[PDB]
Amino acid sequence: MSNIVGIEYNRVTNTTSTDFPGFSKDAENEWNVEKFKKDFEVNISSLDAREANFDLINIDTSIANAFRRIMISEVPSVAAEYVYFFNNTSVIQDEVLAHRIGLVPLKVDPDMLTWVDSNLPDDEKFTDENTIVLSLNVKCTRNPDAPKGSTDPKELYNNAHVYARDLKFEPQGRQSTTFADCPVVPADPDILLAKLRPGQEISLKAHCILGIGGDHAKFSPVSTASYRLLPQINILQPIKGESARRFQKCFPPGVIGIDEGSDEAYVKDARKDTVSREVLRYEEFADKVKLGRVRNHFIFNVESAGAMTPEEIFFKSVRILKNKAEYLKNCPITQ
Amino acid sequence: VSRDTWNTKNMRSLEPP
Amino acid sequence: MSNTLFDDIFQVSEVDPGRYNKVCRIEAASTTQDQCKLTLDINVELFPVAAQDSLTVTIASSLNLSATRSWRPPQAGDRSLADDYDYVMYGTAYKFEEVSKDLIAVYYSFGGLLMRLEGNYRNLNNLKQENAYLLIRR
Amino acid sequence: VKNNLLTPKSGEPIIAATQDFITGSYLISHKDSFYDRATLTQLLSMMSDGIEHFDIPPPAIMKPYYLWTGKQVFSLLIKPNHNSPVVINLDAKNKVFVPPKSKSLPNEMSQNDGFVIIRGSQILSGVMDKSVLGDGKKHSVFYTIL
Amino acid sequence: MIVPVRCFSCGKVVGDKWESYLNLLQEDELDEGTALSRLGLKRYCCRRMILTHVDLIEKFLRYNPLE
Amino acid sequence: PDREKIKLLTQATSEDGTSASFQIVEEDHTLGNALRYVIMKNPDVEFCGYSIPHPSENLLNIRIQTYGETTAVDALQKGLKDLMDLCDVVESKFTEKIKSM
Ligand SMILES: [Zn+2]
C-alpha cells in the first residue's frame, strides 16, 4: 500500500491520504513547512502558448484538486455577456447567435478590466474600465462573378460565412490607449459564428465583461484543466521470450520496452501509460505484474482557451486559493 | 514561454467584486 | 501483567476469504489446550496469515496497563502493551454461550470483525465488557 | 410524515431507504470497509450537516493503524454522541444470509455478513441491508428506533 | 443547425475546426478518424462533437425568404 | 470588516470551545477539502470535516473538534494560516521552475 494507489482488475484501493497525525501511534506527518517546503517538487514537462504539462510532486490530493477546481471555475476571464442586435436577418435566432458569440473566447488579458458592479443603474454600470465592446457588421451579397457551377457558397456569394474574426474591437475612451498595443481579438478567429445567404445581414455589438467559470462556462479560461496520478508498473517476476511481447502489447506502445540480450520485459516509460488494466485480464501475468498509481504525484495538463497562458492560469489558481484562505483568516468570526 | 507575468502585472481581476 | 484475560499459542488451520479481499476468517486450534478452538476475522492486508503458522493470541483489558468523550490515541512514546504485538484490535464480548458441559464459547465483535473463542475454564477472566483488546503476534 | 412511517394495513415500516441509500449503506457496512480518522470524520460530517457533535469511539483496529470499520460509522449514525438517547438492540437476518458452517453455530457466524446484531446502538455484525434499512420489515433499524 | 462553438463536455473550441475537417475529408481525402486526430481532437467528447454533427443550416438556407 | 462571511454556529458549539461548527458563505468543496486536510494535519484536532448542506445555497459548515489543549477557533485559524503557507511554497516552487526551465 503506502502511498501507492492499488490498481486491481475489479477495484481501486488506497485512494486516501493517510498522512496526518492520528493515523497511527506514531503521530507523524503533522503539518510543518520546511518539511513540505523540502519535499514538494515541481517538474514542468512542457510549456506552450496554449498548453502546459507540469508535475506537482509530494502535494496532497485535496490541494491539487483545489487548484484544478479554481482553474476550471474560479479564475476570471472576459467573455461577451450582452449582445445588442441592431439587425439579425440571418436564419440563426438572435438568442442562438448571442450564445455562440458568448462562447467565442476573446484574447483580452484580464487584470486590465474591472469587475462589473451590479448594484448600479444600467446607464452607469458599463464603463471603459468595465467592458469591452465588440461589433459585428456582416452583410451577404451574391457574388456576380461566381464561376460556372460553383456550388461552394464562398465563391457563389460574398460574406456567406460569419467568423469570430468578423467581430471588431470598439475601443471606448481609455481603451483606445490601454488596448492600443493589444486590440481585443477572438483567440479562435475561424469559429463559424453564422452562415448567411444573399439578402441576410447581421449587425450587433457585444459587451464583454469579466466573469467566473462557475457562473457561466463561457468565462472558464481553460479548454481543460486536469491532472492524473503518475502510473506505476511493477514487474514482480521476470517476463521474457514471447510472454514478454504479449506483456508489451497490453500497454501503449512506448510504455514498456524489450531488453536486448536480457530479453526480459522492463518498464520504459510509465508516464506514457493509460491505465487500462489490459494486462490484468490475462491470468498469465497475474503473479508477475502489479499496477499502481502514485497518490501524491500529479501530472497537470492545462490547456488555455486563449486569453492567458496556462502557467498564468495555474499561478492565478494558487493565488486564488491563498487569497480566499487569507480573507477567511482576516474575517472575524460572528456568533 | 518561461517568463513570469504575475510578478510584473497587478492582478486586478482577482479582487472580490 | 494482570491485565491479560487470556493468552495462548494457536496453530492456524484454515484461512479462507469468502467474497472478501482484505478480511479472512482464520480457523486456529490451540497448542497444549486441545479443547481450545478459535475463529477470527482478521485484516490480512495489515496482518497476513497463512495456513499452519503460529499465532500468539492475547486478550487484554486496559491495553496501556477531560470528559472529552472522543477516543484519543496514546502518546507516541508510551510504554504499553501492543508494543510486542503486530496486530491489535479493540472490541466487545457480546455473548457467552455453552457448547457443552465444561465447555463454553465467547464471542467478540471488533467493529464487526467477529471472534469466537472456545474453552472450558476461564470464568474468572473473560467478562462481557467493552474493555477487550485482542493482540496477535506471529 | 413522521407520524406515518408505518402503513396501517400491517404496521410494517413504509418510509425507509431506497435503492442508492441501501447500496451505499451496504458498501459502508461491508466487512472490507476500513476508514482512518480523517475519512471517518469527513463521513460523519457528511452524515450530519457539519453541525452535530460526534464522540469518536476507539478504532476497531489499533495496530498497525487506527482504523474504524463501516459498522462503527453506522453505529455513530444511530447514536452520534452520549447525549443522544437512541440505544437500539436488534437481531435481524439480511436478505442474503448463508448459514454458518455448522448447525450448532449461532446465526451471526454466517459465512457472509448475513445476520445483523446491534447491542447498545453498536453494530456488531451483518451488513446494512434492505431487510434492515428498507420497508416491510419489523426488525428494521428505523422501525426499532421509531 | 451549425457546428457548436465549444465541445459540450470539455469546452474546447470545436467551431473553428468544422471547415478544416470538411476540407480534410474532401481535398486530399483522409479517414474521418485521422482527420479528427489531425485537427487536435484527442478527447472522444471533442471527437463526437464533430463526428456526430449534422449541418442542418445548409439545408435551412435553401429556404431563405429574403433572396 | 466582513461579519457575514464566517459565523460560529452556537447550537453546535460545546462549552469551553474545543468543538464548533463554522458556517462559511460563498465557499464550496475547493476551500472545504483543503482546509479539512490542513486542519487534520494538526495534532490537536480529533475531528475535522465540512458539509455543504444544500447545493442551492452557497454555504459551508465545517466541524472542528479538538482535545482539551486548544479550541476549535484556534485550530481553524491555524489551518487557514497553514494553507496560506502551503500556497506560498507552491507559488515559490512554480515561479522558480517557470523562470528556470
Ligand atoms: Zn471536448
Side-chain angles (χ1 to χ4, degrees), chain A residues 136-195:
Chain A
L136 166 60
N137 283 292
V138 49
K139 164 89 176 295
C140 202
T141 68
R142 197 132 190 159
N143 183 50
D145 36 284
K148 162 234 98 272
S150 237
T151 138
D152 354 54
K154 332 294 291 110
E155 25 259 71
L156 233 176
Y157 330 106
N158 314 293
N159 309 59
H161 287 231
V162 184
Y163 298 102
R165 44 200 124 119
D166 309 9
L167 270 164
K168 312 299 181 203
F169 175 42
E170 316 292 293
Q172 315 280 144
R174 300 174 194 73
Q175 289 172 32
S176 323
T177 117
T178 63
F179 293 100
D181 312 8
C182 32
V184 178
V185 281
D188 304 65
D190 296 357
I191 292 170
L192 196 33
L193 270 184
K195 280 131 113 166

Side-chain angles (χ1 to χ4, degrees), chain E residues 7 9-12 43 45-46:
Chain E
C7 174
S9 319
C10 329
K12 171 177 174 28
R43 302 189 277 274
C45 72
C46 317

Side-chain angles (χ1 to χ4, degrees), chain C residues 18-86:
Chain C
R19 321 298 272 144
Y20 290 135
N21 291 297
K22 69 179 52 166
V23 174
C24 287
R25 192 157 263 171
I26 75 171
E27 256 269 2
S30 193
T31 88
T32 66
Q33 266 50 47
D34 36 13
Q35 312 183 264
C36 192
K37 271 79 152 67
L38 183 75
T39 298
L40 176 51
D41 288 5
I42 289 176
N43 200 334
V44 278
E45 160 200 44
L46 311 184
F47 183 80
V49 199
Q52 312 285 120
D53 58 47
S54 164
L55 287 193
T56 320
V57 181
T58 295
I59 300 175
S61 35
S62 186
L63 176 75
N64 303 297
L65 68 105
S66 72
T68 185
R69 291 272 46 191
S70 283
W71 176 83
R72 183 185 193 158
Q75 314 289 150
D78 281 333
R79 266 292 286 134
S80 83
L81 220 54
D83 272 299
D84 324 285
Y85 286 96
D86 308 307

Side-chain angles (χ1 to χ4, degrees), chain A residues 298-319:
Chain A
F298 295 84
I299 300 161
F300 266 85
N301 187 266
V302 189
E303 322 179 346
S304 101
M308 327 167 252
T309 56
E311 60 263 51
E312 199 217 333
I313 291 168
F314 181 71
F315 175 104
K316 274 176 148 175
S317 88
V318 301
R319 172 137 299 161

Side-chain angles (χ1 to χ4, degrees), chain A residues 223, chain E residues 6-14 41 43-49:
Chain A
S223 102
Chain E
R6 323 277 217 97
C7 174
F8 290 151
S9 319
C10 329
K12 171 177 174 28
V13 175
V14 299
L41 308 168
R43 302 189 277 274
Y44 76 78
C45 72
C46 317
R47 280 178 85 77
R48 68 88 153 77
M49 287 279 318

